[PDB]
Hints:
CATH superfamily of chain A: Aldolase class I
Bound molecules: ligand 2F0, inosinic acid
Largest sheet of chain A: 8 strands, parallel, barrel
CATH architecture of chain A: Alpha-Beta Barrel
Shape of chain A: globular
CATH class of chain A: Alpha Beta
Distance between the termini of chain A: 51 Å
Number of domains of chain A: 1
Structural class of chain A: alpha/beta
Oligomer: homotetramer
Strand content of chain A: 15-25%
Largest interface: A-B, 63 and 73 residues
Order of helices and strands of chain A: EEEEHEHEHEHEHEHHEHEHEEHEHHEHE
Number of strands of chain A: 16
CATH topology of chain A: TIM Barrel
Amino acid sequence: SNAMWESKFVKEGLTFDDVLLVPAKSDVLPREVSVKTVLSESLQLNIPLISAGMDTVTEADMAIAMARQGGLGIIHKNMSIEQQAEQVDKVKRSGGLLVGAAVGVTADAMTRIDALVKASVDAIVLDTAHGHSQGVIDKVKEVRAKYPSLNIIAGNVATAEATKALIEAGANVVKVGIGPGSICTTRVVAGVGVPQLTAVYDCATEARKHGIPVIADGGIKYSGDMVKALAAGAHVVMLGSMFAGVAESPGETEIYQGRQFKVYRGMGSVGAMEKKLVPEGIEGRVPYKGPLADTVHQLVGGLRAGMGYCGAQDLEFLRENAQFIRMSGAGLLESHPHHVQITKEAPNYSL
Amino acid sequence: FQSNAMWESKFVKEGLTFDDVLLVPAKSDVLPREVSVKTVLSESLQLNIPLISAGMDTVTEADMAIAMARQGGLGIIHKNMSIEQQAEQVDKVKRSGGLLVGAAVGVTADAMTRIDALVKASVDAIVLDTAHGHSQGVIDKVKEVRAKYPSLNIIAGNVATAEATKALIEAGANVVKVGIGPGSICTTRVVAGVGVPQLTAVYDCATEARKHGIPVIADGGIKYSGDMVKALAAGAHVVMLGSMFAGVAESPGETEIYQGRQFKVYRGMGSVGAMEKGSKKLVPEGIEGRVPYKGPLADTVHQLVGGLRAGMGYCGAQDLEFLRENAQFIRMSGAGLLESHPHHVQITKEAPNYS
Amino acid sequence: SNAMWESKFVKEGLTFDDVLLVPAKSDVLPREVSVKTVLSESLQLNIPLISAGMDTVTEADMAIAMARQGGLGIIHKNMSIEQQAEQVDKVKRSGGLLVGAAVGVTADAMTRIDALVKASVDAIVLDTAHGHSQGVIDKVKEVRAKYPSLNIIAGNVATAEATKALIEAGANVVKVGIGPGSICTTRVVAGVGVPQLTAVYDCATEARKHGIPVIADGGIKYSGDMVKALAAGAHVVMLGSMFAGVAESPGETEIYQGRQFKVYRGMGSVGAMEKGKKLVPEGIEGRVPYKGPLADTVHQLVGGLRAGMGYCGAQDLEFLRENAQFIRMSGAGLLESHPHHVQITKEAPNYS
Amino acid sequence: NAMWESKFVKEGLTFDDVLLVPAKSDVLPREVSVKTVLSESLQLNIPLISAGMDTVTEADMAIAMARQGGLGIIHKNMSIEQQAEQVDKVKRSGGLLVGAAVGVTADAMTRIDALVKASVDAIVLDTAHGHSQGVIDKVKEVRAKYPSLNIIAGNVATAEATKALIEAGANVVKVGIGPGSICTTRVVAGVGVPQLTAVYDCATEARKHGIPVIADGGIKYSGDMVKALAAGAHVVMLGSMFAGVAESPGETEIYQGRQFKVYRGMGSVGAMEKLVPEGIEGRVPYKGPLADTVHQLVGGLRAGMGYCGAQDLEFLRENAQFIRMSGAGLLESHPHHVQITKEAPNYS
Ligand SMILES: C/C(=N\O)c1cccc(C(C)(C)NC(=O)Nc2ccc(Cl)c(C(N)=O)c2)c1
Ligand SMILES: C/C(=N\O)c1cccc(C(C)(C)NC(=O)Nc2ccc(Cl)c(C(N)=O)c2)c1
Ligand SMILES: C/C(=N\O)c1cccc(C(C)(C)NC(=O)Nc2ccc(Cl)c(C(N)=O)c2)c1
Ligand SMILES: C/C(=N\O)c1cccc(C(C)(C)NC(=O)Nc2ccc(Cl)c(C(N)=O)c2)c1
Ligand SMILES: O=c1[nH]cnc2c1ncn2[C@@H]1O[C@H](COP(=O)(O)O)[C@@H](O)[C@H]1O
Ligand SMILES: O=c1[nH]cnc2c1ncn2[C@@H]1O[C@H](COP(=O)(O)O)[C@@H](O)[C@H]1O
Ligand SMILES: O=c1[nH]cnc2c1ncn2[C@@H]1O[C@H](COP(=O)(O)O)[C@@H](O)[C@H]1O
Ligand SMILES: O=c1[nH]cnc2c1ncn2[C@@H]1O[C@H](COP(=O)(O)O)[C@@H](O)[C@H]1O
């Protein structure tokens, strides 16, 4: 059987910069469109934005800000169970907001989940590097079996086989993304990954047939990518780098060459793990952006504008009807502003 | 439930831009100086050259519109001013020598009031400028202007699809403007993620517009004279330039020394600065910047036309109709683009038509 | 007939940096291969390369050294009729070596050629921006009629139909290249051109039916490009930028930031056209690093060809033209092809 | 006129063109097997071979490589006496596996004799063009004299060359024409085949004869090695990623507060000391002891095989799938839009 040998290089992948959204007939202004989205009856959002579960991205103050903006925050797991449980309770006491918490496939996973459920968390996030693993699937089964009503976000995966496997396991929402992270080196050190736009589209295609929403995680640098991700089949996107510079992100502002910066690093980086192994991430920094409200406004505003061009009144019409168009690298250069000295920065370009 | 066929066509379309192709040479019986660059937009509108200056606050006002018209082209006076002022600019150009002049109009409730003054100032064409030309507000506005002014030249845009062009034409538009996101100072494709590669956009719109005997305008993306030849060869009747005109003397704005030499301010109309003056929080779709000073407009126009004449000479095109209907392209890679530009040599002197 | 409108973006073109020559079975060592080429009964070269007819590339001194290496030189036409016919004879009297001279499509074209024939050139180059035009077509007919046995090299062209046109006009050698020049902007200011390698392959395809040789003109920056051009069907290549740093080339040495340089400019540049706000140039002017004698540069070029032919197993250029295969690669391949992830300490005699 | 129309048909791929597609896994990365068997006389515990160059592999490197489960190839830019001594030096350092480079020359068989007497485990017939009649005749000459000897001949990049070379009597085929970090062969000769395609085309032919192949050149990250192995290679050979370690020949030089070591191609002017070089000369960063580089290399392999659901290198060789991407894909694959503060032990 040469089926496997003769099909090693057949597949093709696309990402955000390979593609443009084709404008269609619009009977709706950007301010008129609806950006609401539903993961489940117990989990509904006013904006399709979820902050990443990372030690440099989301804690108590970040989750409260995201929820009050209409989004969701996933509290990272690089803390004790008691700490994460009382961080969830802190967010819930802050006005009955929505909040999530990250959990890993370990031995104390169910022990941590108990406290999170005891803290009345809305959704736990089973975060692993390879979501198509047997341990992950088996772990999801244990959770659903004990908590039939609890929202379970399982990831990360990048194929249809993996999405189906987790859906049958019992996951309500499937997080998609192997490699596209701004601080990720998984595709560099392991040589493993799938281009994000193709990944989201492939995983959605399977998940769309189960009534299962998918999360576009990592890879988004501009507002336009979020629109591309949602139109590719995603119900909601997850951001790390664009939320790291935000004031409400966990961290103290440092100074580099006079400017204000915030520490942003991978969970698979050396620094994050220590708090010798082979890292699948790096340690870096992003400019301080101020309050979250300004970043959200630029992001959501870009989505509204994008939905307006496609004639999409709401997010579902976008997924069902939006058409992309492929372009070369030369098209990307035309897409970006070109051949002009940039006097000053825009609040949506670069960040 | 549903059975979606649109789902499997999400990534089937692919688009080309200027740096993706080259014009293939052909048998030629005409010298570059012998060719014709004249075009017809409508019965009442005719240009000797395929150049139109963009309706931007940093590109086209009276002095620009006058200079452009005297070169054989057309100038679209921007709408970032009062209705009276705009009508005054249109009058100033019309009086100068019976020169042609255009005016930019947005889809507002003030639109008809603005157009009334423009027509009274004897404007030759109005441009219905909007980020999304395939919109109801635009289409409905075209109907309303065509009804009240049955003989007024209406330029409608911007669109990037064939269905949109067809929609504008049936709304009563004389000319269709094509270009979503290729602008030098544009970030629409970056902040909204929406667009079509300009050469593909121009070509597809021209395919639909051909059916109705309607001309189209290639707007944005042009950074060299060769790009203009491609746009016209793609099927466009006329090109619209913003960045190559902004550094010209007649353009609005004073000169400023940056990086050791003279520069002129050039910004996108969807940028912060270009809208905070006509506002009294937004998400911009353009940036603010500056382009190098290039002196009188005549020098720029001569380079553009000359490059067009050479390109038409390589193709054997005695006129622009033969160019649109006969010219062939050839798709190349990024490696082909590097070969096309000068390479492996330190350029010591600045060329009139390069960098 | 909506065919012409629908067949607008069908064609795809390849340049040198899109392909690699696939190695083949070899029973011949690189030093054993034959690099000799036959353009005509009267024009035979030991090595397959010609110095371009430009005012910063080829005059008498360059033409002589080029011919002593087994190549050919084309005296540029940026000089009076007397000046060109003069230093053509200057080459013709430094041995029995060969020499060429560029001629334009003017009202006094025939007058210049007559002086060159009296100076006894081996080949004239009817050179123009657009070879596929009646002005050039009827000019070749004129020369071919007056001089039945004169080697006529017409160009430039980039399509098979154009190559066919020049051959039937009277040209026995066709020069290929519309815009791949290093000092060229024709592609940028006119939007016109064909990716050189595909241009050579298309032109050679048609020209081969008539037994007519093809010159791969322009677009060569490394010796590997030459091997690809010859393998693409070309008999001989023509160089400009690689011959300008050579001492024998016209112009004097300029020093920039501690290094020696020599002026290299396009014949369509503003500087070239001024000598002989007006016109629109299709070329630029600049400088290239001084290389020294022609012998050193020409040794690295042929050496690359000999190695390249050895990999493909070609004993002579004919076997290379008839059998050598390519393989396309993306931008990721091109970067792998060049040195990478290693900080170069010294310049190599044949790399950058 | 079929050979004329065939010229521009083929398409090639390299490491930066694709990504490995993650598959269902029941295995942890630390549990996977990275052992490999080239021949019954030559078995490696890790799929890493130190390249036979004068800036990469000598006695000190070959010993350190062998103790990690890898292999070292002593370069032949030295006398027959010296190379045989280096071979004997590694062998008397605990009976470690050693390899030695041999070229196609007059003193070829003479050199091989001295290496055989020094009990070399494998000889590498290292040539620029493996598909030449000279190398083929040389392999035939060597195999006839030493039936039980391991012969690694190269380099090739086609299935034709691999077949003709296996028929010559070689046990291992080394693949790679031009992918080298210090190589200019594709630039100066215009000849080459994209490594990942070359490995695939060669391994396709080779496995029909049950013959292993070496992926030689082009690797800049551990992920590339995983790709090379998943393309059909039994084992890879590294130059630049080893030239900076402490066990490599050459001493640390210093430039602007960062340590470097010399690394140049064997086809460069320096290593060949008019000559027409097919390589350049330069320097790579100093990376301390070999065990740190190797740890990252293998650890990255285990991660890859983990994602692919591969329990051993044979599974990865027969089942792993690739997905093709553009330049934008590669941009997304590497970190982006974030100013890297400190360097990872496995990333630049
Ligand atoms: C998100 C992420 N990678 O994408 C990450 C986060 C923390 C640690 C790590 C580390 C431990 C460095 N990498 C890691 O666990 N990789 C890995 C690779 C392959 C498999 Cl099969 C597994 C696994 N345990 O399933 C894990 C990775
Ligand atoms: C020309 C241009 N964009 O190309 C532009 C000009 C001024 C403001 C703007 C701003 C206000 C920033 N954006 C804007 O009008 N966006 C937009 C997006 C989508 C739609 Cl459907 C619409 C619309 N109302 O047609 C407008 C854009
Ligand atoms: C080689 C080359 N251009 O690529 C060149 C050389 C000298 C002058 C020129 C100038 C005069 C600047 N350009 C030029 O003659 N271009 C040109 C363009 C199109 C045609 Cl159809 C013609 C022509 N007369 O055939 C010439 C160009
Ligand atoms: C490894 C390598 N090239 O990849 C190399 C090593 C040393 C010298 C050389 C030199 C001498 C510079 N080149 C070389 O042998 N080239 C070459 C080219 C073509 C052939 Cl057919 C041959 C050959 N005789 O096999 C050799 C190359
Ligand atoms: O250390 C890492 N290695 C690989 N992926 C990571 C790592 N840390 C975070 N990620 C992923 O990348 C996402 C953020 O990527 P970003 O949106 O490009 O900033 C996170 O939500 C995770 O899914
Ligand atoms: O701010 C903006 N955002 C997006 N497009 C713009 C903006 N302002 C002007 N444009 C378009 O871009 C064109 C100029 O493109 P350019 O000639 O390539 O500089 C104008 O004629 C408009 O069609
Ligand atoms: O100014 C010019 N414009 C366009 N092509 C030129 C010009 N000058 C020289 N060329 C062509 O470019 C060739 C040199 O290309 P190079 O070898 O890549 O430097 C010449 O032999 C001519 O065919
Ligand atoms: O100078 C040379 N010219 C061409 N290839 C070379 C030369 N020197 C070494 N190589 C090859 O390149 C490999 C190293 O490439 P790297 O692993 O990418 O550094 C070696 O193992 C050889 O196969």
